């Protein structure tokens, strides 16, 4: 799957140097592509596996969304697990709630990805995505 930003259309979640951001015209476009597996800490949740780096998952660390090799720890699995919810800015779209930090959501901010509290209208828009099956 791919994930487009809804307020920066044509921008996609991608990994650059093992760090999550949103970019247009992702090159190599495979950096924008993930396998969606059951949540490592909860199968009613989701986890994001790298397509180019199998066994690496998107995960938050110091509230920054990064890519990191799987580790056999509860903290890693929790850091790597997100609940898909109706979009903050648009219920026809999606948002990603952190499993171990329930009041923090994946959002972009100067085109980097974090998990942060969603308080304002711009917060909601920065945290809203369109899943695209590829
Ligand atoms: Na903070």
Curated annotation (Swiss-Prot):
Source superkingdom: Bacteria
Native source organism of the sequence: Acetivibrio thermocellus (strain ATCC 27405 / DSM 1237 / JCM 9322 / NBRC 103400 / NCIMB 10682 / NRRL B-4536 / VPI 7372) (Clostridium thermocellum)
| Subunit | Interacts (via RsgI N-terminal anti-sigma domain) with SigI5.
Q: Which gene encodes it?
A: rsgI5
Its localization reads:
Cell membrane
Q: What does this protein do?
A: Anti-sigma factor for SigI5. Negatively regulates SigI5 activity through direct interaction. Binding of the polysaccharide substrate to the extracellular C-terminal sensing domain of RsgI5 may induce a conformational change in its N-terminal cytoplasmic region, leading to the release and activation of SigI5.
Report the protein name in the record.
Anti-sigma-I factor RsgI5
């Amino acid at each position: 799957m791919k994930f487009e930003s809804s307020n920066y259309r044509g921008y996609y979640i991608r990994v650059k140097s093992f760090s999550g951001r949103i970019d247009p015209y992702v090159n190599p476009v495979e950096d924008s592509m993930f396998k969606i597996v059951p949540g490592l800490a909860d199968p009613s949740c989701i986890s994001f596996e790298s397509k180019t780096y199998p066994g690496y998952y998107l995960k938050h660390e110091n509230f920054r969304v990064i890519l990191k090799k799987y580790e056999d720890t509860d903290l890693f699995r929790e850091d790597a697990t997100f609940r898909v919810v109706p979009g903050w800015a648009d219920e026809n779209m999606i948002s990603f709630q952190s499993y171990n930090y329930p009041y923090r959501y994946i959002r972009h901010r100067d085109f980097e990805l974090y998990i942060e509290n969603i308080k304002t209208d711009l917060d909601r828009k920065d945290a809203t995505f369109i899943g695209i099956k590829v």
